[PDB]
Amino acid sequence: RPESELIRQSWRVVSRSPLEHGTVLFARLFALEPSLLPLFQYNGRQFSSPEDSLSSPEFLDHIRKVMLVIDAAVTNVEDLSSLEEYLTSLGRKHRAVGVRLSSWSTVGESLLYMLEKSLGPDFTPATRTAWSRLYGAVVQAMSRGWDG
Ligand code: HEM
Numbered sequence: 001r002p003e004s005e006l007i008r009q010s011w012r013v014v015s016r017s018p019l020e021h022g023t024v025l026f027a028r029l030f031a032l033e034p035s036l037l038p039l040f041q042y043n044g045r046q047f048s049s050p051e052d053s054l055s056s057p058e059f060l061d062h063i064r065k066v067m068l069v070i071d072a073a074v075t076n077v078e079d080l081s082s083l084e085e086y087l088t089s090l091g092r093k094h095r096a097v098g099v100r101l102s103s104w105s106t107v108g109e110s111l112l113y114m115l116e117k118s119l120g121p122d123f124t125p126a127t128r129t130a131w132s133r134l135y136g137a138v139v140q141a142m143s144r145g146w147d148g
Pocket of ligand 1: 036039062066090097103
């Protein structure tokens with residue numbers, strides 16, 4: 001598919017520096033939804049402010065893990081149903097940590113933003129639409145952790 005390569009070409013840019021880009025994703029995400037901030041409870045302590053997350057080595061490890069999952073979503077963009085059970089259960093983990101169903105769309109907006117930021121003019125209206133479908137397929141999978 002053409003779309004699937006568009007995701008693949010786009011991702012390449014981001015993939016190179018996962019931490020720098022995921023940092024953007026998370027700063028954006030807390031700007032949009034600041035109530036995600038206390039869900040991280042590294043050392044049984046809440047971050048007070050968004051900037052405190054960036055100083056947390058455990059938080060940065062999480063960014064890396066996030067980018068790795070989006071990475072898997074990319075490598076499997078043509079057949080994404082192979083990631084489904086993983087993503088379901090990652091969703092369930094996240095429900096437990098206290099993330100809402102509604103928060104996942106903000107993560108998708110935040111992913112999208114990180115992408116727009118990184119590709120600048122290369123973030124075509126097609127590139128956008130394709131990414132939105134990919135991550136939507138990721139939430140949709142991460143939302144089956146809310147089931148039963
Ligand atoms: C939406 C806001 C998010 C919050 C508040 C959040 C929070 C957390 C927390 C607190 C953990 C457990 C502590 C840790 O391993 O660092 C966790 C684990 C994880 N997160 Fe997130 N997360 C979010 C989004 C994401 C997204 C979008 C992804 C990937 C798409 C991601 C991927 C992971 C993975 C891979 C783990 C390890 C899970 C495991 O035990 O198997 N997270 N997250």
